[PDB]
Amino acid sequence: VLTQSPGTLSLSPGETAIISCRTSQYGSLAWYQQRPGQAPRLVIYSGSTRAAGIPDRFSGSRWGPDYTLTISNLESGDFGVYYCQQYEFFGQGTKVQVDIKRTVAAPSVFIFPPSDEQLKSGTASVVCLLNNFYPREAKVQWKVDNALQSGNSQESVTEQDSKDSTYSLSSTLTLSKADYEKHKVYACEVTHQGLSSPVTKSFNRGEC
Amino acid sequence: QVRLSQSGGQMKKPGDSMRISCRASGYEFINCPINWIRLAPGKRPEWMGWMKPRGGAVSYARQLQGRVTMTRDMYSETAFLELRSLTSDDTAVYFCTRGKYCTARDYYNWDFEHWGQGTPVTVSSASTKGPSVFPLAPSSKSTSGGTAALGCLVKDYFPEPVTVSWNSGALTSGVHTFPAVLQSSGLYSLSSVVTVPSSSLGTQTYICNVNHKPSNTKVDKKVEPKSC
Amino acid sequence: VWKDADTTLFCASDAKAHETEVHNVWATHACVPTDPNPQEIHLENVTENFNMWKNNMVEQMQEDVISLWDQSLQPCVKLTGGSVIKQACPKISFDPIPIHYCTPAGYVILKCNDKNFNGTGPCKNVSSVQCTHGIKPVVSTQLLLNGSLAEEEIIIRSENLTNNAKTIIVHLNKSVEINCTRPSNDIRKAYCEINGTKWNKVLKQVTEKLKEHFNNKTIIFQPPSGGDLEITMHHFNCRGEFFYCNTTQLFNNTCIGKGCNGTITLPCKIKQIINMWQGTGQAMYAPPIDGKINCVSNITGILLTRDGGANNTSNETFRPGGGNIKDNWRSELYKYKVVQIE
Ligand SMILES: *[C@@H]1O[C@H](CO)[C@@H](O)[C@H](O)[C@H]1NC(C)=O
Ligand SMILES: *[C@@H]1O[C@H](CO)[C@@H](O)[C@H](O)[C@H]1NC(C)=O
Ligand SMILES: *[C@@H]1O[C@H](CO)[C@@H](O)[C@H](O)[C@H]1NC(C)=O
Ligand SMILES: *[C@@H]1O[C@H](CO)[C@@H](O)[C@H](O)[C@H]1NC(C)=O
Ligand SMILES: *[C@@H]1O[C@H](CO)[C@@H](O)[C@H](O)[C@H]1NC(C)=O
Ligand SMILES: *[C@@H]1O[C@H](CO)[C@@H](O)[C@H](O)[C@H]1NC(C)=O
Ligand SMILES: *[C@@H]1O[C@H](CO)[C@@H](O)[C@H](O)[C@H]1NC(C)=O
Ligand SMILES: *[C@@H]1O[C@H](CO)[C@@H](O)[C@H](O)[C@H]1NC(C)=O
Ligand SMILES: *[C@@H]1O[C@H](CO)[C@@H](O)[C@H](O)[C@H]1NC(C)=O
Ligand SMILES: *[C@@H]1O[C@H](CO)[C@@H](O)[C@H](O)[C@H]1NC(C)=O
């Protein structure tokens, strides 16, 4: 009933955060801010009315069923997680985190087949590494014999590096041993601004 | 000034029940309904129900019906929350809240201007489980005078955390230890990787050192090129 | 020309100056006699907005009823503010009389006569009156007793049905009797009797009306989730005594889906120690009077709360209870509003 997007915003101080929430029913919508280690705070209620203490840098808008919270001139105290709300319903949340800017850098992609030691167990883990890229936004898709995979993958991302300001991502595809031995081509496809076209790293099961 | 003060955090096991309190002040306690909202990392904030100090009237969220109880003490102006049959899914920070608009005549419940500081509740088994460490082999490609990637996959441990070093901390450059992920089985897993020159694979030995204090487990694993 | 406004109303009644009955005594010093030939002007080509949930007529009646009860139903012991008050607590004569509320000079009451008016929004057939109809200040929970009926269909009333924190008032178009009795010769034990054949047919009509509001979903009734006895049970006053009746059998989902056809008997008890609905605290009253204590009432409405939550279920769940006592006056004042003449 409440669809909030995007999941994450990685912005620098001074920039503007645009956070949207799509509802299936009209009625007073509120926005909340949760700073790290602190209780959530009411920012906006009734679509566009600011709560007490909230600076005019925060503003709410609505177009059709789409509600938007815009935060201009981001400060340190503005970063955290934001939630939209209608009655007892809340959005998934939007994480606004500090991003230090640098030149665009494409990721180096590596794919790792399951170990033989692990295949003895009964499950197979396929790991795809995206190393040292910027900006944070990147898409990973798994393909098994050229068939798109969904629901069997988990991702993890590092904090922005304090030296080179890059990010690194790890995606793991998990299959049963039996299912793993049913297919040949295991491919992982990376799309990122630093690449002119999507890059695919793959291996064939069995051959080295 | 309106204030909501909650009781201290606590740790619980699955099967236990829990009770937390929310002490109110700065307004006419009987005029305004009190809500309970819980927050867990990565999930939607979840409304558990409201409670009106007048008569102690309650409305519980459908998915919690039967396991939650909300009471109050008029004299001490304190609201209470009880949650039974705890599991891991109940791990969260629990807040009591009250609507911004509340008079002796009317209220709007859902604009939560007033929050308690929150009460952390962790529900977990006392059992511990050591990790399985599998190698992420450097693979027989990636140039001759370029950079290769290798690491180890640290799978199925409980609880957090594990730490990873390489060559007893002698190797730090290009090392990335990823945040763990929670699997469907309820067990954690992470990867640690390092990029090194490809020309060093036949010379330098690379060992990941996995530490898991809760299970008292220290495991070293050598990651070398597959032989074929 | 006029405009919506609030003012200090005055009450009118047919109270007997000789009656020892409590409501009669109150109305004797608080109200004026009624008008033998009331005037009503049906305004033509006039459409007006109404809002029963924002009607300050309700606030004034509440103050009156509180004033009445506070001055008439005095306890032996009053426990409030951490202190103890001990007074005399003689038995009284108790039976609510109709009370009319009227506007002073410069003000007139507009009355909505749309037969299907749900409580909020525009009204086509508006008339002008000086006084409301006679309203009996019946204090009760869960069930509305001895009130007026809806003229045509059963009407669901709420400020906002999507809001689970907002009370739902169900307005019946056919009354069903509830017959409560404390027999002569445990003295505190009692019961209420209801024709299950009549009630279940009405309750079936209620769910069918509710289906019109909730996308033909399965309608389900459940007992109250918690709270003091005043809200988890049907609480009311009969002949001065405080009754608490269990309504679990009144909302039997099986009967509105073979056997339910007959007489329904609800277990009731008379309590000497109650929570005052005036929001004060605990009051201690004397034991019940002897002989048969009986009240035959018209069930004319139901107070409901709907279950909410971040769920995805094919059925809506409703529970007896509602908001507070002010809602009892709302259900009778819903078709009225005060306007100021220029
Ligand atoms: C119902 O609530 C919405 C906002 O939640 C409000 O705009 C609307 O006017 C309400 N409806 C009525 C009939 O009061
Ligand atoms: C309003 O009055 C007219 C005139 O008799 C009548 O035909 C109509 O049914 C009335 N409408 C309602 C909603 O009662
Ligand atoms: C009452 O009727 C109005 C039409 O003006 C509608 O907007 C509102 O939703 C109705 N309320 C209920 C409870 O049916
Ligand atoms: C009451 O209203 C219902 C529809 O809500 C209707 O079916 C029933 O016949 C009515 N009963 C009367 C008018 O006595
Ligand atoms: C109760 O309802 C019946 C018919 O429904 C009616 O005749 C009787 O007068 C009502 N009781 C009152 C108005 O006190
Ligand atoms: C109410 O019930 C009693 C039995 O407890 C019975 O004697 C009496 O006749 C009933 N009253 C009516 C009006 O049916
Ligand atoms: C009402 O009676 C039912 C039937 O046994 C019982 O389960 C319920 O607890 C009773 N309610 C109260 C408030 O005592
Ligand atoms: C509902 O009615 C059925 C059939 O008469 C009966 O067996 C059952 O006990 C009733 N339940 C309640 C809660 O009254
Ligand atoms: C209930 O009322 C109906 C009339 O609607 C009547 O026929 C029936 O006999 C009554 N049941 C009992 C037990 O008196
Ligand atoms: C309802 O009215 C009847 C007759 O007018 C009366 O006997 C009964 O006690 C009243 N009920 C209540 C709860 O006041």
XYZ file of N, CA and C and ligand atoms in Angstrom, chain C residues 118 120-122 156 158 161 213, ligand 3:
38
model
N -25.493 9.785 6.052
C -24.597 8.948 6.840
C -23.889 9.675 7.983
N -21.988 12.739 7.554
C -21.137 13.799 7.009
C -21.444 14.060 5.538
N -21.238 15.298 5.101
C -21.433 15.649 3.706
C -22.679 16.479 3.469
N -23.049 16.666 2.193
C -24.190 17.507 1.810
C -25.547 16.859 2.096
N -24.084 2.865 8.324
C -22.768 2.805 8.944
C -22.206 4.216 9.067
N -19.043 6.765 10.448
C -17.668 6.938 10.907
C -17.046 8.185 10.293
N -13.633 5.595 7.814
C -13.602 4.138 7.928
C -12.208 3.551 7.699
N -19.301 -1.478 2.292
C -18.251 -0.521 2.625
C -16.854 -1.122 2.538
C -20.828 9.545 3.663
O -21.179 10.134 2.415
C -20.134 10.944 1.854
C -20.694 11.565 0.595
O -20.702 12.983 0.680
C -18.896 10.090 1.594
O -17.843 10.917 1.112
C -18.463 9.383 2.871
O -17.413 8.467 2.581
C -19.636 8.619 3.473
N -19.257 8.000 4.733
C -19.541 6.728 5.034
C -19.081 6.250 6.379
O -20.140 5.995 4.251
